[PDB]
Amino acid sequence: MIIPVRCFSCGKVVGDKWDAYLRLLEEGKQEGDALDELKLKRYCCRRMVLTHVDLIEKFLRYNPLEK
Amino acid sequence: VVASKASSSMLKIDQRNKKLNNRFIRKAEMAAVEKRKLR
Amino acid sequence: LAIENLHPDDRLLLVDPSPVFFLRRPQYVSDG
Amino acid sequence: GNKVHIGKVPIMLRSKFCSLRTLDEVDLYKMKECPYDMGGYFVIN
Amino acid sequence: VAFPNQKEMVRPLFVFSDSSITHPEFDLFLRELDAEGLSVMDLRDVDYKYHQLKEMSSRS
Amino acid sequence: GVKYTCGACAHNFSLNKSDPVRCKECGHRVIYKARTKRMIQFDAR
Amino acid sequence: DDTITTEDCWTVISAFFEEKGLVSQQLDSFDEFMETSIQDLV
Ligand SMILES: [Zn+2]
Ligand SMILES: [Zn+2]
Structure with missing residues (x-):
């Protein structure tokens, strides 16, 4: 739904690296190189950013219920 | 629509990745099939 | 240019x- | 003798006679319909 | 609407202010009415207006 | 006495248990109650 | 010409799913029923 704050397995904070990851991918870097540049060594952390699906961008497209 | 910046970036990444996959996977398959043929 | 444009010996x-x-x-x- | 009303036939969603066949992508959000919904079912009660 | 001293005016609704009418404002309105030679709404008519507004606001 | 919110235009209003269930300004038939004024506390766990 | 690989097969399958969809049979059957079947039943 939205990038988790901590890696499930170990507990490293990965919630502050989603925007940087997208910026790096925008510049043409490969996914492995982008994850390496963010200093994500353990594959337990790498799966958190690699396999995250961002669904909040789909929930936000609905008109807000209040105003 | 006025899509958000993250969505536009994701769309660009998806287009690039689709093109790169369509090239590299096809090239690897062509490389493998000729080797399997000559064996 | 890219890696492809590099000379094959330089690629080696x-x-x-x-x-x-x-x-x-x-x-x-x-x-879909 | 003219158009006499004989009944009401339930409409399959996303079919040719559904209101969602048109409306594009943007208006599908204003109607609170998921664009991933595929139709093919009826709504009875 | 119309000021007593001034003439008739057609105004939109938002021109009025939610703030209460002050003592000098009502005094000036009374002085303008006296200058024109007009009177103030009767207390019976004031009660009739109050009942009309209460009926209208609480109507279903 | 209790607030309500329209389902289409998100307009706040109130009802007196005798008005028809309807938005005053767009005539929508579906309205929602507003959130309670009580304190809401969570354990952050 | 040139040989056909697996990726070309997946391109063709992608075209199939782009046109038809996954529930095309339900919608096609219902459209056939509404367009012509009711009139013939009458
Ligand atoms: Zn980890
Ligand atoms: Zn409304």
């Missing part, structure tokens, strides 16, 4: 101190 100088068909690059929109 790039030695690690090939793609495989079953490792796709991740996507987000898929297709």
Whole structure:
């Protein structure tokens, strides 16, 4: 739904690296190189950013219920 | 629509990745099939 | 220019101190 | 003798006679319909 | 609407202010009415207006 | 006495248990209650 | 010409799913029923 704050397995904070990851991918870097540049060594952390699906961008497209 | 910046970036990444996959996977398959043929 | 435009002998100088068909690059929109 | 009303036939969603066949992508959100919904079912009660 | 001293005016609704009418404002309105030679609404008519507004606001 | 919110235009209003269930300004038939004024506390776990 | 690989087969399958969809049979059957079947039943 939205990038988790901590890696499930170990507990490293990965919630502050989603925007940087997208910026790096925008510049043409490969996914492995982008994850390496963010200093994500353990594959337990790498799966958190690699396999995250961002669904909040789909929930936000609905008109807000209040105003 | 006025899509958000993250969505536009994701769309660009998806287009690039689709093109790169369509090239590299096809090239690897062509490389493998000729080797399997000559064996 | 890129790695392809490099001379083949100079490419041979790039030695690690090939793609495989079953490792796709991740996507987000898929297709259909 | 003219158009006499004989009944009401339930409409399959996303079919040719459904209101969602048109409306594009943007208006599908204003109607609170998921664009991933595929139709093919009826709504009875 | 119309000021007593001034003439008739057609105004939109938002021109009025939610703030209460002050003592000098009502005094000036009374002085303008006296200058024109007009009177103030009767207390019976004031009660009739109050009942009309209460009926209208609580109507279903 | 209790607030309500329209389902289409998100307009706040109130009802007196005798008005028809309807938005005053767009005539929508579906309205929602507003959130309670009580304190809401969570354990952050 | 040139040989056809697996990726071309997946391109063709993608075209199939782009046109038809996954529930095309339900919608096609219902459209056929509404367009012509009711009139013939009458
Ligand atoms: Zn970890
Ligand atoms: Zn409304």
